[PDB]
């Protein structure tokens, strides 16, 4: 009889069959495969060397000699030329596999890029048909100017990382050095978002209050009141006096540490508001919401300056927004793994850094905008080529636990990662340094202090906790 | 399919191998043979339907069949068959050499034959020259 091995494709003098597949093999090959992988090579069923049935029928007849195969040296010559073609074939396969994975990424990308277009037009068609179905009878330019240096200029000053920044061996001693209680009312406690400015900090409560707080003194600085629902996002202004906060009551209210009342209010959203961010000039507020809209306004006069629907015709969770101090090339995160950088003059996307299937809770640029990090509760965190719109590095873990917040350090050389638990990485080496389990519940917001020497956190454990070494 | 049944002799489309036989059958043949006789047609061992596995080809990863005639296994095979022939050839030559070399060593009488000729001729001379 005649048989060919499924692994090698050659004739075999020792045909054998696994009990867990129909395919037949040369015994010494499948045994060597089993000795590595313990599995059927084709069905991937678990396989052991005793589950092999042997065909005692006579193996394939010998291949006739070539006339050049009639002499021993010419067999060795033929064996050499045969061997070279076999190795070139094996080398061609690993090249072809690399090319196939390049093209698969690009087609899925081009497929997922087309789905961005289908989604916009389908809702815009739907809103057009809905009308029929119910028919009854400027600083941005200076931001471009600043972007026309700072996205390319900042090598001129950022020549080195700071010398006083924590070394990888030092941050390994991180421990919960303070614990804070009584920041918010005990009838409906909880802290859902956090921001800091040096040792000053600002807290959003489940009790529908915003509290200015000092996490070094363990002291309330000021309590701001006027929201009708619990807080969803906050920003603390570098002036140490102004504060901005966003709530489930669909409004944004601006406060001053001198005042018990609103410095300004933005009434600009259709549903609960989700995130806010500050222009690097300080005068202007940038905002996003669960209604699929984003809005941008002047803080210093209260005037709204531009607003657009990201995609109208559906209530879809935008859940992050940021400003980038070159002037532009910043973006928003939204429900269906959107991470869209915005062509702010044209009300359309400019770039993207998705890395997830699930929504993205936070987006942070580095000082010079040649690093960015993103993460999501589908269980990974990744570092991003702001300069070229590609992936660079990945953090991965066994459990794929929820990740609730992220933060660079002061410089972008460390990155805190966590949610159900907390860890910190030294990004300049890209190695894990320490694991922190002193929280008794999920973390909701993260900041780092100067030189990475401290870490500030809020949690569902009904406390605010600070880590340092 | 390329499998030929051992019992019907046809190229089968339902290839099945039985663990006791190590041999290839049609499914439609072996099930009724088990039903009517419970026995492997080849070895006359017992059979039961759990001892039967059905063959397949062309699954994912299954290498393309080499048809170029040359292969590394087949060249190493025939280089091995050359080597066995040359050693058994060389062994019989070595045996032949030992036999020939043995007897020509035992046959080394020729100097002792020469002394007998000397002894005979000297006797002859003294027996010829006495008158």
């Amino acid at each position: 009889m005649s048989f060919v091995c499924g692994i090698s494709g050659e004739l075999t003098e020792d045909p054998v069959v696994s009990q867990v597949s129909g395919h037949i093999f040369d015994r010494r090959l499948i045994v060597k495969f089993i000795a590595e992988n313990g599995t059927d090579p084709i069905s991937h069923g678990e396989l052991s060397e005793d589950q092999l049935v042997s065909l005692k029928s006579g193996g394939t007849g010998s291949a006739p000699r070539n006339v050049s195969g009639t002499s021993i040296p010419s067999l060795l010559k033929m064996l050499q030329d045969e061997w070279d073609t076999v190795m070139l074939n094996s080398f061609s396969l690993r090249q072809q596999l690399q090319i196939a994975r390049q093209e698969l990424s690009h087609s899925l990308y081009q497929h997922d890029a087309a789905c961005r277009v289908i989604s916009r037009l389908s809702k815009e068609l739907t809103a057009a048909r809905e009308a029929l179905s119910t028919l009854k009878p400027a600083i941005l330019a200076k931001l471009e100017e600043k972007s026309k240096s700072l996205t390319a200029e900042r090598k001129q000053r950022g020549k080195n990382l700071p010398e006083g920044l924590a070394k990888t061996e030092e941050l390994a001693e991180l421990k919960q050095t303070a614990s804070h209680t009584g920041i918010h009312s005990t009838g409906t406690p909880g802290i859902t978002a956090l921001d800091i400015k040096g040792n000053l900090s600002l807290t959003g409560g489940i009790d529908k209050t915003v509290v200015l707080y000092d996490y070094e003194k363990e002291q309330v600085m000021q309590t701001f009141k006027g929201h009708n629902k619990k807080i969803n996002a906050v920003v603390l202004h570098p002036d140490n006096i102004t504060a901005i906060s966003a709530s489930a009551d669909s409004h944004i209210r601006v406060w001053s540490a001198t005042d018990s009342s609103s410095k300004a209010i933005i009434d600009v959203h259709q549903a609960p508001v989700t995130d806010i961010s500050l222009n690097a000039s300080g005068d202007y507020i940038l905002s996003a919401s669960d209604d699929s809209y984003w809005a941008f306004s002047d803080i210093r006069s209260g005037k709204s300056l531009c607003k657009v629907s990201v995609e109208p015709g559906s209530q879809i969770a935008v859940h992050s927004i940021e400003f980038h101090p070159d002037g532009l090339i910043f973006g928003t995160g939204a429900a269906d793994a959107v991470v869209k950088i915005w062509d702010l003059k044209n009300q359309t996307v400019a770039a993207a850094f998705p890395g997830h299937t699930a929504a993205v809770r936070s987006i942070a640029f580095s000082e010079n905008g040649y690093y960015l990090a993103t993460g999501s509760e589908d269980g990974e965190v990744k570092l991003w080529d702001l300069r070229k719109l590609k992936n660079l590095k990945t953090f991965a873990n066994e459990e794929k636990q929820p990740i609730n917040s992220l933060s660079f350090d002061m410089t972008g050389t460390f990155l805190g990662i966590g949610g159900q638990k907390v860890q910190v990485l030294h990004v300049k080496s890209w190695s894990e340094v320490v694991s922190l389990s002193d929280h008794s519940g999920p973390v909701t917001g993260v900041r780092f202090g100067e030189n990475a020497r401290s870490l500030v956190t809020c949690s569902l454990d009904k406390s605010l906790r600070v880590f340092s070494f | 399919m390329s499998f030929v049944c051992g019992i019907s002799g046809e190229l089968t489309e339902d290839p099945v191998v039985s663990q006791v036989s190590g041999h290839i059958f049609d499914r439609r043949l072996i099930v009724k043979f088990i039903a009517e006789n419970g026995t492997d047609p080849i070895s006359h061992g017992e059979l039961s339907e759990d001892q039967l596995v059905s063959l397949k080809s062309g699954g994912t990863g299954s290498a393309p069949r080499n048809v170029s005639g040359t292969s590394i296994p087949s060249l190493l095979k025939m280089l091995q068959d050359e080597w066995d022939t040359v050693m058994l050839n060389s062994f019989s030559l070595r045996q032949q050499l030992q036999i020939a070399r043995q007897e020509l060593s035992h046959s080394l009488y020729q100097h002792d034959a020469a002394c007998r000729v000397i002894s005979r001729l000297s006797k002859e001379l003294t027996a010829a020259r006495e008158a």
């Binding site: 007849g61 010998s62 000699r65 | 025939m78 068959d81 066995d84």
Partner: peptide
């Protein structure tokens, strides 16, 4: 060991000689 296929030569010669020849 190499030309063991000569069994197939005689078999195909035998099968060929079964043409224009008797039962069994």
């Amino acid at each position: 060991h190499e030309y063991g296929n000569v069994i197939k030569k005689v078999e195909e010669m035998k099968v060929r000689r079964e043409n224009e020849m008797l039962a069994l």
